[PDB]
Design a protein around this ligand. Sequence first.
Ligand SMILES: C[C@H](c1cccc2ccccc12)N1CCC(C(=O)NCc2ccc(F)cc2)CC1
Ligand SMILES: [Zn+2]
Length: 305
Amino acid sequence: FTTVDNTNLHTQLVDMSMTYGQQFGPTYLDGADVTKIKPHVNHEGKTFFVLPSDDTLRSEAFEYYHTLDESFLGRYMSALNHTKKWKFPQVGGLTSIKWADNNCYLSSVLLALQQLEVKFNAPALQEAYYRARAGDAANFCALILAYSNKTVGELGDVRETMTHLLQHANLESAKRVLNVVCKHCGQKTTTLTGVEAVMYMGTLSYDNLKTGVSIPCVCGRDATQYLVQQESSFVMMSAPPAEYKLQQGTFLCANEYTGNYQCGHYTHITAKETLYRIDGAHLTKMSEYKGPVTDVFYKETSYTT
Ligand SMILES: C[C@H](c1cccc2ccccc12)N1CCC(C(=O)NCc2ccc(F)cc2)CC1
Ligand SMILES: [Zn+2]
Protein backbone atom coordinates (compact mmCIF):
# COMPACT_ATOMS: atom_id res chain seq x y z
CA PHE A 1 0.00 0.00 0.00
CA THR A 2 1.57 3.22 -1.22
CA THR A 3 -0.13 6.62 -1.45
CA VAL A 4 0.62 10.24 -2.11
CA ASP A 5 -2.77 11.60 -1.07
CA ASN A 6 -3.92 9.17 1.70
CA THR A 7 -7.14 8.67 -0.29
CA ASN A 8 -6.03 6.32 -3.06
CA LEU A 9 -4.01 3.37 -1.83
CA HIS A 10 -2.00 1.26 -4.23
CA THR A 11 -1.26 -2.31 -3.06
CA GLN A 12 2.32 -3.37 -3.64
CA LEU A 13 4.39 -6.48 -2.79
CA VAL A 14 7.75 -6.06 -1.06
CA ASP A 15 11.15 -7.80 -1.28
CA MET A 16 13.24 -8.84 1.76
CA SER A 17 16.42 -7.68 0.08
CA MET A 18 16.26 -3.94 -0.49
CA THR A 19 15.18 -0.84 1.38
CA TYR A 20 12.03 1.06 0.49
CA GLY A 21 14.22 3.73 -1.07
CA GLN A 22 15.39 1.04 -3.44
CA GLN A 23 12.00 -0.32 -4.42
CA PHE A 24 9.83 2.81 -3.93
CA GLY A 25 12.26 5.69 -4.32
CA PRO A 26 12.06 8.33 -1.59
CA THR A 27 9.67 6.80 0.95
CA TYR A 28 8.13 7.51 4.36
CA LEU A 29 5.84 6.01 7.00
CA ASP A 30 4.17 7.75 9.95
CA GLY A 31 6.53 10.70 9.44
CA ALA A 32 9.43 8.42 10.27
CA ASP A 33 11.22 8.65 6.92
CA VAL A 34 11.93 4.96 6.26
CA THR A 35 13.53 5.41 2.84
CA LYS A 36 16.79 3.57 3.52
CA ILE A 37 15.29 0.73 5.66
CA LYS A 38 13.95 -2.78 5.02
CA PRO A 39 10.58 -4.63 5.47
CA HIS A 40 9.28 -5.59 8.90
CA VAL A 41 8.05 -8.70 10.72
CA ASN A 42 4.83 -6.95 11.88
CA HIS A 43 3.31 -3.91 10.19
CA GLU A 44 2.92 -5.06 6.58
CA GLY A 45 -0.41 -3.95 5.18
CA LYS A 46 1.11 -0.55 5.96
CA THR A 47 0.34 2.54 3.94
CA PHE A 48 3.52 4.38 2.83
CA PHE A 49 4.10 7.85 1.37
CA VAL A 50 6.04 8.08 -1.84
CA LEU A 51 7.22 10.46 -4.47
CA PRO A 52 5.21 10.35 -7.68
CA SER A 53 7.64 7.77 -9.06
CA ASP A 54 5.25 7.19 -11.95
CA ASP A 55 2.55 8.80 -14.12
CA THR A 56 -0.26 7.75 -11.76
CA LEU A 57 1.03 8.84 -8.34
CA ARG A 58 2.04 12.10 -10.12
CA SER A 59 -1.45 12.53 -11.36
CA GLU A 60 -2.98 11.89 -7.90
CA ALA A 61 -0.52 14.22 -6.20
CA PHE A 62 -1.48 17.02 -8.57
CA GLU A 63 -5.30 16.63 -8.30
CA TYR A 64 -5.08 16.60 -4.52
CA TYR A 65 -2.42 19.29 -3.88
CA HIS A 66 -2.67 21.32 -7.11
CA THR A 67 1.08 21.49 -7.30
CA LEU A 68 3.71 20.11 -9.62
CA ASP A 69 6.56 20.87 -7.19
CA GLU A 70 8.57 17.66 -6.87
CA SER A 71 9.93 18.79 -3.43
CA PHE A 72 6.50 19.54 -2.00
CA LEU A 73 5.54 16.17 -0.35
CA GLY A 74 8.96 15.85 1.31
CA ARG A 75 8.78 19.38 2.77
CA TYR A 76 5.21 18.67 3.79
CA MET A 77 6.23 15.49 5.61
CA SER A 78 9.07 17.24 7.46
CA ALA A 79 6.79 19.97 8.70
CA LEU A 80 4.11 17.45 9.74
CA ASN A 81 6.73 15.81 11.96
CA HIS A 82 6.81 18.96 14.12
CA THR A 83 3.30 20.43 13.77
CA LYS A 84 1.60 17.17 14.86
CA LYS A 85 3.43 17.93 18.16
CA TRP A 86 1.81 21.39 18.51
CA LYS A 87 -1.10 22.36 20.79
CA PHE A 88 -4.27 23.86 19.29
CA PRO A 89 -6.49 25.35 22.03
CA GLN A 90 -9.92 26.90 21.41
CA VAL A 91 -9.50 30.59 22.25
CA GLY A 92 -12.39 33.05 22.11
CA GLY A 93 -14.28 30.45 20.12
CA LEU A 94 -11.54 29.87 17.51
CA THR A 95 -8.80 27.32 16.91
CA SER A 96 -5.42 28.88 17.63
CA ILE A 97 -1.89 27.65 18.31
CA LYS A 98 0.14 27.48 21.51
CA TRP A 99 3.31 29.38 20.83
CA ALA A 100 6.23 27.28 19.58
CA ASP A 101 8.84 27.39 16.78
CA ASN A 102 8.06 30.97 15.90
CA ASN A 103 4.56 29.87 14.86
CA CYS A 104 3.08 33.23 15.66
CA TYR A 105 2.32 34.13 12.17
CA LEU A 106 0.67 30.79 11.41
CA SER A 107 -1.41 31.26 14.47
CA SER A 108 -2.56 34.64 13.10
CA VAL A 109 -3.19 33.18 9.62
CA LEU A 110 -5.28 30.34 10.99
CA LEU A 111 -7.29 32.61 13.30
CA ALA A 112 -8.03 35.08 10.52
CA LEU A 113 -9.09 32.42 7.93
CA GLN A 114 -11.64 31.07 10.42
CA GLN A 115 -13.46 34.38 10.14
CA LEU A 116 -13.41 34.83 6.38
CA GLU A 117 -15.98 33.36 3.98
CA VAL A 118 -13.23 31.66 2.03
CA LYS A 119 -12.84 28.19 0.41
CA PHE A 120 -9.81 26.43 -1.01
CA ASN A 121 -9.63 24.76 -4.37
CA ALA A 122 -6.86 22.33 -3.55
CA PRO A 123 -8.65 19.35 -1.97
CA ALA A 124 -5.72 18.91 0.50
CA LEU A 125 -6.35 22.49 1.71
CA GLN A 126 -10.18 22.27 1.79
CA GLU A 127 -9.95 19.13 3.86
CA ALA A 128 -7.13 20.10 6.13
CA TYR A 129 -8.91 23.35 6.81
CA TYR A 130 -12.22 21.75 7.74
CA ARG A 131 -10.29 19.67 10.29
CA ALA A 132 -8.43 22.74 11.56
CA ARG A 133 -11.76 24.46 12.14
CA ALA A 134 -12.59 21.54 14.45
CA GLY A 135 -9.30 21.99 16.22
CA ASP A 136 -7.23 19.40 14.41
CA ALA A 137 -4.77 21.71 12.73
CA ALA A 138 -1.37 20.01 12.30
CA ASN A 139 -1.85 18.93 8.66
CA PHE A 140 -3.20 22.31 7.81
CA CYS A 141 -0.28 24.09 9.41
CA ALA A 142 2.18 21.80 7.65
CA LEU A 143 0.41 22.49 4.37
CA ILE A 144 0.71 26.25 4.89
CA LEU A 145 4.42 25.88 5.50
CA ALA A 146 4.85 23.74 2.39
CA TYR A 147 2.75 25.90 0.07
CA SER A 148 4.80 28.93 1.03
CA ASN A 149 8.21 27.33 1.10
CA LYS A 150 8.84 27.86 4.79
CA THR A 151 10.19 25.50 7.42
CA VAL A 152 9.29 25.03 11.08
CA GLY A 153 11.10 27.46 13.36
CA GLU A 154 11.40 30.36 10.98
CA LEU A 155 9.55 33.51 11.81
CA GLY A 156 7.38 34.43 8.87
CA ASP A 157 5.29 37.21 7.45
CA VAL A 158 1.54 36.92 7.59
CA ARG A 159 0.81 39.00 4.47
CA GLU A 160 3.34 36.98 2.34
CA THR A 161 1.87 33.81 3.66
CA MET A 162 -1.67 34.80 2.75
CA THR A 163 -0.37 35.67 -0.63
CA HIS A 164 0.76 32.07 -1.21
CA LEU A 165 -2.40 30.55 0.31
CA LEU A 166 -4.96 32.78 -1.41
CA GLN A 167 -3.49 31.71 -4.77
CA HIS A 168 -5.15 28.45 -3.76
CA ALA A 169 -8.38 30.09 -2.66
CA ASN A 170 -11.61 30.37 -4.61
CA LEU A 171 -11.27 34.00 -5.84
CA GLU A 172 -12.62 33.14 -9.20
CA SER A 173 -15.41 35.68 -8.90
CA ALA A 174 -13.61 38.42 -6.95
CA LYS A 175 -13.25 41.77 -8.69
CA ARG A 176 -11.75 45.12 -7.69
CA VAL A 177 -11.79 48.27 -9.78
CA LEU A 178 -9.69 51.27 -8.87
CA ASN A 179 -9.62 54.71 -10.34
CA VAL A 180 -6.32 56.52 -10.44
CA VAL A 181 -5.93 60.27 -10.73
CA CYS A 182 -3.28 62.91 -11.40
CA LYS A 183 -4.50 66.53 -11.42
CA HIS A 184 -1.57 67.33 -13.72
CA CYS A 185 -2.83 64.45 -15.88
CA GLY A 186 -5.90 62.39 -16.86
CA GLN A 187 -7.75 59.53 -15.16
CA LYS A 188 -6.87 55.82 -15.43
CA THR A 189 -9.22 52.92 -14.63
CA THR A 190 -7.65 49.64 -13.47
CA THR A 191 -9.35 46.31 -12.78
CA LEU A 192 -7.77 43.72 -10.50
CA THR A 193 -8.48 39.98 -10.14
CA GLY A 194 -7.21 37.02 -8.18
CA VAL A 195 -5.22 37.83 -5.06
CA GLU A 196 -4.92 41.60 -5.69
CA ALA A 197 -8.73 41.91 -5.80
CA VAL A 198 -8.80 41.22 -2.07
CA MET A 199 -5.26 42.10 -0.88
CA TYR A 200 -3.95 45.71 -0.77
CA MET A 201 -0.63 46.92 0.53
CA GLY A 202 -0.33 50.56 1.55
CA THR A 203 -2.91 51.47 4.14
CA LEU A 204 -4.70 49.68 6.96
CA SER A 205 -7.97 51.56 6.51
CA TYR A 206 -10.59 50.28 3.99
CA ASP A 207 -12.27 53.71 4.26
CA ASN A 208 -9.06 55.42 3.28
CA LEU A 209 -9.12 53.33 0.07
CA LYS A 210 -12.71 54.36 -0.56
CA THR A 211 -12.09 58.13 -0.14
CA GLY A 212 -8.72 58.18 -1.87
CA VAL A 213 -5.14 57.28 -0.87
CA SER A 214 -1.93 58.97 -2.13
CA ILE A 215 1.75 58.38 -3.09
CA PRO A 216 4.71 60.28 -4.81
CA CYS A 217 3.78 60.74 -8.55
CA VAL A 218 5.37 60.08 -12.01
CA CYS A 219 5.32 63.58 -13.67
CA GLY A 220 5.63 66.42 -11.10
CA ARG A 221 3.14 66.20 -8.19
CA ASP A 222 1.37 63.32 -6.37
CA ALA A 223 -1.26 60.86 -7.74
CA THR A 224 -4.36 59.39 -6.02
CA GLN A 225 -6.11 56.01 -6.00
CA TYR A 226 -9.67 55.26 -5.03
CA LEU A 227 -12.02 52.32 -4.94
CA VAL A 228 -14.78 52.51 -7.46
CA GLN A 229 -15.94 48.92 -7.08
CA GLN A 230 -15.36 45.88 -4.91
CA GLU A 231 -16.90 42.37 -5.15
CA SER A 232 -15.84 39.83 -2.53
CA SER A 233 -16.58 38.23 0.81
CA PHE A 234 -13.79 40.19 2.53
CA VAL A 235 -10.72 42.34 1.99
CA MET A 236 -7.29 42.42 3.63
CA MET A 237 -5.58 45.82 4.16
CA SER A 238 -1.85 45.78 4.91
CA ALA A 239 0.93 48.28 5.62
CA PRO A 240 4.29 48.29 7.38
CA PRO A 241 3.45 48.25 11.08
CA ALA A 242 2.16 51.57 12.29
CA GLU A 243 0.41 53.08 15.29
CA TYR A 244 -3.27 52.61 14.60
CA LYS A 245 -6.51 52.64 16.63
CA LEU A 246 -8.96 49.75 16.29
CA GLN A 247 -12.57 50.39 17.33
CA GLN A 248 -15.41 47.98 17.90
CA GLY A 249 -17.78 47.82 14.95
CA THR A 250 -15.23 49.07 12.39
CA PHE A 251 -13.34 46.02 11.23
CA LEU A 252 -13.43 42.24 11.40
CA CYS A 253 -9.99 41.20 12.61
CA ALA A 254 -6.40 42.46 12.55
CA ASN A 255 -2.76 41.53 13.27
CA GLU A 256 -0.34 43.48 15.38
CA TYR A 257 3.36 43.10 15.00
CA THR A 258 5.83 44.22 17.66
CA GLY A 259 9.55 44.29 17.01
CA ASN A 260 11.67 45.06 13.98
CA TYR A 261 11.81 43.45 10.56
CA GLN A 262 14.20 40.66 11.60
CA CYS A 263 12.58 39.60 14.82
CA GLY A 264 9.27 40.31 16.48
CA HIS A 265 5.97 39.04 17.68
CA TYR A 266 2.52 38.82 16.15
CA THR A 267 -0.74 38.74 18.03
CA HIS A 268 -4.25 38.66 16.60
CA ILE A 269 -7.12 41.01 17.37
CA THR A 270 -10.79 40.15 16.65
CA ALA A 271 -13.93 42.08 17.61
CA LYS A 272 -16.88 40.12 18.97
CA GLU A 273 -18.98 41.43 21.87
CA THR A 274 -15.81 43.35 22.63
CA LEU A 275 -12.20 43.44 21.25
CA TYR A 276 -10.12 40.34 21.92
CA ARG A 277 -6.37 39.96 21.59
CA ILE A 278 -5.24 36.39 20.99
CA ASP A 279 -1.61 35.62 21.71
CA GLY A 280 -1.45 31.88 21.05
CA ALA A 281 -2.91 30.23 24.11
CA HIS A 282 -3.50 33.66 25.70
CA LEU A 283 -6.60 35.90 25.53
CA THR A 284 -7.22 39.34 26.88
CA LYS A 285 -10.15 41.74 26.43
CA MET A 286 -10.37 45.45 25.75
CA SER A 287 -12.84 48.08 24.60
CA GLU A 288 -10.36 49.77 22.26
CA TYR A 289 -6.80 49.36 21.01
CA LYS A 290 -3.96 51.54 19.81
CA GLY A 291 -0.86 49.72 18.71
CA PRO A 292 1.42 48.71 15.84
CA VAL A 293 -0.90 47.06 13.37
CA THR A 294 0.08 45.62 10.05
CA ASP A 295 -2.96 43.78 8.63
CA VAL A 296 -6.68 44.62 9.01
CA PHE A 297 -9.46 42.40 7.62
CA TYR A 298 -12.92 43.80 6.64
CA LYS A 299 -16.18 42.03 5.74
CA GLU A 300 -17.62 42.66 2.26
CA THR A 301 -20.30 41.46 -0.19
CA SER A 302 -20.58 44.13 -2.88
CA TYR A 303 -19.43 47.75 -2.84
CA THR A 304 -19.77 50.36 -5.48
CA THR A 305 -19.56 54.16 -5.41
C1 LIG B 1 4.75 42.73 9.55
C2 LIG B 1 6.22 42.69 9.39
C3 LIG B 1 6.59 43.87 8.39
C4 LIG B 1 6.02 43.86 7.16
C5 LIG B 1 6.35 44.92 6.17
C6 LIG B 1 7.25 45.88 6.50
C7 LIG B 1 7.86 45.89 7.83
C8 LIG B 1 8.80 46.89 8.15
C9 LIG B 1 9.42 46.88 9.44
C10 LIG B 1 9.11 45.91 10.36
C11 LIG B 1 8.20 44.90 10.04
C12 LIG B 1 7.56 44.92 8.74
N1 LIG B 1 6.95 41.38 8.88
C13 LIG B 1 8.39 41.46 8.47
C14 LIG B 1 9.07 40.13 8.31
C15 LIG B 1 8.97 39.33 9.54
C16 LIG B 1 9.88 38.13 9.37
O1 LIG B 1 9.47 37.17 8.80
N2 LIG B 1 11.19 38.15 9.91
C17 LIG B 1 12.09 37.01 9.73
C18 LIG B 1 13.37 37.51 9.15
C19 LIG B 1 14.61 37.10 9.66
C20 LIG B 1 15.77 37.65 9.13
C21 LIG B 1 15.73 38.64 8.06
F1 LIG B 1 16.86 39.13 7.56
C22 LIG B 1 14.46 39.06 7.56
C23 LIG B 1 13.31 38.52 8.10
C24 LIG B 1 7.55 38.98 9.76
C25 LIG B 1 6.62 40.18 9.71
ZN1 LIG C 1 0.51 62.23 -12.93
